[PDB]
Amino acid sequence: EVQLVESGGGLVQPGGSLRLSCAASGFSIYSYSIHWVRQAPGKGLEWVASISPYSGYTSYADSVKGRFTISADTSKNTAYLQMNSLRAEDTAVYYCSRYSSYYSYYYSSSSYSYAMDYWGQGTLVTVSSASTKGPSVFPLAPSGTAALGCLVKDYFPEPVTVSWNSGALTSGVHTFPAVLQSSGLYSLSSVVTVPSSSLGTQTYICNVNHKPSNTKVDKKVEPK
Amino acid sequence: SSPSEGLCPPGHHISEDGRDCISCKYGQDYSTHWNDLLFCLRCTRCDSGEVELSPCTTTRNTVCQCEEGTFREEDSPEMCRKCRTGCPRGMVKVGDCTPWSDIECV
Amino acid sequence: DIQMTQSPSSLSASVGDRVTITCRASQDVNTAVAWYQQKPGKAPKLLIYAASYLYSGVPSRFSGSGSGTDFTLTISSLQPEDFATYYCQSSSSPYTFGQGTKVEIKRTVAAPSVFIFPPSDEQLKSGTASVVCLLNNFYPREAKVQWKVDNALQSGNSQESVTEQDSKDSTYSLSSTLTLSKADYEKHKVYACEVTHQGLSSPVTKSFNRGEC
Last residue of a domain, one of A108, A129, A150: A129
User: Cβ–Cβ of A106/B77 closer than 8 Å?
Assistant: no
- Chain B contact partners (≥3 CB pairs within 8 A): A, C
- Are A63 and A144 part of one and the same domain? no
CA dihedral (C57, C61, C62, C67) positive or negative = positive
Q: Which of C87, C97, C132 sits opposite A189 (nearest CB)?
A: C132
Q: Which residues of A touch B3 (CB under 8 A)?
A: 106
Q: Which residues of B touch C93 (CB under 8 A)?
A: 39, 41-42
Please state, in angstroms and rounded to a whole number, the distance separating the CA atoms of residues C9 and C7.
6
C70-75 and C19-25 as β-strands: parallel, antiparallel, unpaired?
A: antiparallel
User: Cβ–Cβ of C117/A178 closer than 8 Å?
Assistant: no
Chain C residue with minimum CA distance to A122: C43
Is B5 part of the contact surface with chain A (CB cutoff 8 Å)? yes
- Are B48 and B37 part of one and the same domain? no
Please state, in angstroms and rounded to a whole number, the distance separating the CA atoms of residues B106 and C16.
70
Chain B residue with minimum CA distance to C33: B38
- Are B31 and B63 part of one and the same domain? no
- β partners of residue B34: none
Please state, in angstroms and rounded to a whole number, the distance separating the CA atoms of residues B87 and B33.
44
Amino acid A54 reads: Y
Q: Which of A44, A95, A120 sits opposite C99 (nearest CB)?
A: A44
Q: Give me the residues of C, 19-58, that contact A with CB < 8 A.
A: 32, 34, 36, 38, 43-46, 49-50, 53, 55-56
Query: Does residue B35 lie within any of the structural domains?
Result: yes
- Are A47 and A153 part of one and the same domain? no
How far is B12 from chain A, CA to nearest CA, in Å? Answer: 14
Q: Do the two domains C1-107 and C108-213 of this chain adopt the same fold?
A: yes
- Are B37 and B56 part of one and the same domain? no
Query: Does residue B15 lie within any of the structural domains?
Result: yes
For C140-190, the DSSP string reads SS--EEEEEESS-B--SSEEEEEPPPPTTT--EEEEEEEEEEHHHHTT--E
Query: Does residue B88 lie within any of the structural domains?
Result: no
H or E element: which one contains C125? helix C121-125
- Are A83 and A4 part of one and the same domain? yes
Note whether B10 and B37 are within 8 A (CB): no
Note whether A46 and A61 are within 8 A (CB): yes
- Chain A contact partners (≥3 CB pairs within 8 A): B, C
Note whether A37 and A51 are within 8 A (CB): no
Mention the CATH class of domain C108-213. mainly beta
Query: Does residue B1 lie within any of the structural domains?
Result: yes
Distances in whole angstroms, Cα of residue B52 to Cα of each of A203, A214, B59, B100: 74, 55, 16, 15
Please state, in angstroms and rounded to a whole number, the distance separating the CA atoms of residues B14 and A17.
37
The domain that contains B64 carries what CATH number? 2.10.50.10
How far is C169 from chain A, CA to nearest CA, in Å? Answer: 12
- Are B32 and B55 part of one and the same domain? no
Query: Does residue B102 lie within any of the structural domains?
Result: no
H or E element: which one contains A69? strand A68-73
Q: CATH homologous superfamily for C1-107?
A: Immunoglobulins (2.60.40.10)
- Chain C contact partners (≥3 CB pairs within 8 A): A, B
| Residue of A216, A220, A221 lying closest to A135 (CA atoms) | A216
- Are A109 and A158 part of one and the same domain? no
How far is A101 from chain B, CA to nearest CA, in Å? Answer: 7
- Are B30 and B52 part of one and the same domain? no
Neighbour count for residue C140 (Cβ, 10 Å): 18
Amino acid A134 reads: G
Please state, in angstroms and rounded to a whole number, the distance separating the CA atoms of residues A14 and C107.
45
Query: Does residue B70 lie within any of the structural domains?
Result: yes
Q: Give me the residues of C, 52-111, that contact B with CB < 8 A.
A: 92-93
The domain that contains A47 carries what CATH number? 2.60.40.10
A21-28 long-range Cβ contacts below 8 angstroms, 24+ apart: A21/A78, A21/A80, A22/A78, A22/A79, A22/A80, A22/A81, A22/A96, A22/A120, A23/A77, A23/A78, A24/A77, A24/A78, A24/A79, A24/A98, A25/A77, A26/A1, A26/A2, A27/A2, A27/A98, A27/A108, A28/A74, A28/A77, A28/A107, A28/A108
- Are A122 and A156 part of one and the same domain? no
Is B39 part of the contact surface with chain C (CB cutoff 8 Å)? yes
Please state, in angstroms and rounded to a whole number, the distance separating the CA atoms of residues B36 and B15.
8
Q: Which of C120, C132, C161 sits opposite A177 (nearest CB)?
A: C161
Please state, in angstroms and rounded to a whole number, the distance separating the CA atoms of residues C195 and C213.
22
User: Cβ–Cβ of C30/B37 closer than 8 Å?
Assistant: no
Query: Does residue B10 lie within any of the structural domains?
Result: yes
How far is A75 from chain C, CA to nearest CA, in Å? Answer: 27
| Residue of C98, C82, C96 lying closest to C37 (CA atoms) | C82
C190-196 and A136-140 as β-strands: parallel, antiparallel, unpaired?
A: unpaired
User: Cβ–Cβ of A193/C96 closer than 8 Å?
Assistant: no
Q: Give me the residues of A, 191-210, that contact C with CB < 8 A.
A: 191, 193
- Are A136 and A77 part of one and the same domain? no
Q: Which residues of A touch B7 (CB under 8 A)?
A: 54-55, 103, 106
Please state, in angstroms and rounded to a whole number, the distance separating the CA atoms of residues C13 and C164.
16
* Number of domains into which chain A is organized: 2
Please state, in angstroms and rounded to a whole number, the distance separating the CA atoms of residues C98 and C22.
11
Amino acid C130 reads: S
Q: Which residues of B touch C30 (CB under 8 A)?
A: 38-39
Please state, in angstroms and rounded to a whole number, the distance separating the CA atoms of residues A192 and A210.
20
Please state, in angstroms and rounded to a whole number, the distance separating the CA atoms of residues C114 and C200.
11
* Number of domains into which chain B is organized: 2
Classify residue A19 by burial, with Cβ atoms within 10 Å: 0-12, 13-18, 19+: middle
Burial of B64-82, coded b for 16+ CB within 10 Å and e otherwise, reads bbbeeebbbeeeeeeebee
Last residue of a domain, one of A70, A103, A129: A129
Please state, in angstroms and rounded to a whole number, the distance separating the CA atoms of residues C108 and C171.
10
User: Cβ–Cβ of A66/B74 closer than 8 Å?
Assistant: yes
Please state, in angstroms and rounded to a whole number, the distance separating the CA atoms of residues A218 and A199.
18
Chain C residue with minimum CA distance to B36: C92
Chain B residue with minimum CA distance to A56: B33
How far is C72 from chain B, CA to nearest CA, in Å? Answer: 21
Note whether A81 and A20 are within 8 A (CB): yes
- Are A124 and A165 part of one and the same domain? no
- Are B3 and B31 part of one and the same domain? yes
Q: Which of B6, B35, B38 sits opposite A57 (nearest CB)?
A: B35
Q: Which domain holds residue B64?
A: 42-81
Q: Domain map of chain C by residue range?
A: 1-107, 108-213
Last residue of a domain, one of A129, A159, A189: A129
Q: Which domain holds residue A49?
A: 1-129
Please state, in angstroms and rounded to a whole number, the distance separating the CA atoms of residues C160 and C171.
16
Phi, psi of B50 (to 5 degrees): -105, 160
User: Cβ–Cβ of A141/C120 closer than 8 Å?
Assistant: yes
- Are A62 and A17 part of one and the same domain? yes
- Are A116 and A191 part of one and the same domain? no
Is B36 part of the contact surface with chain A (CB cutoff 8 Å)? yes
Neighbour count for residue C74 (Cβ, 10 Å): 15
Query: Does residue B30 lie within any of the structural domains?
Result: yes
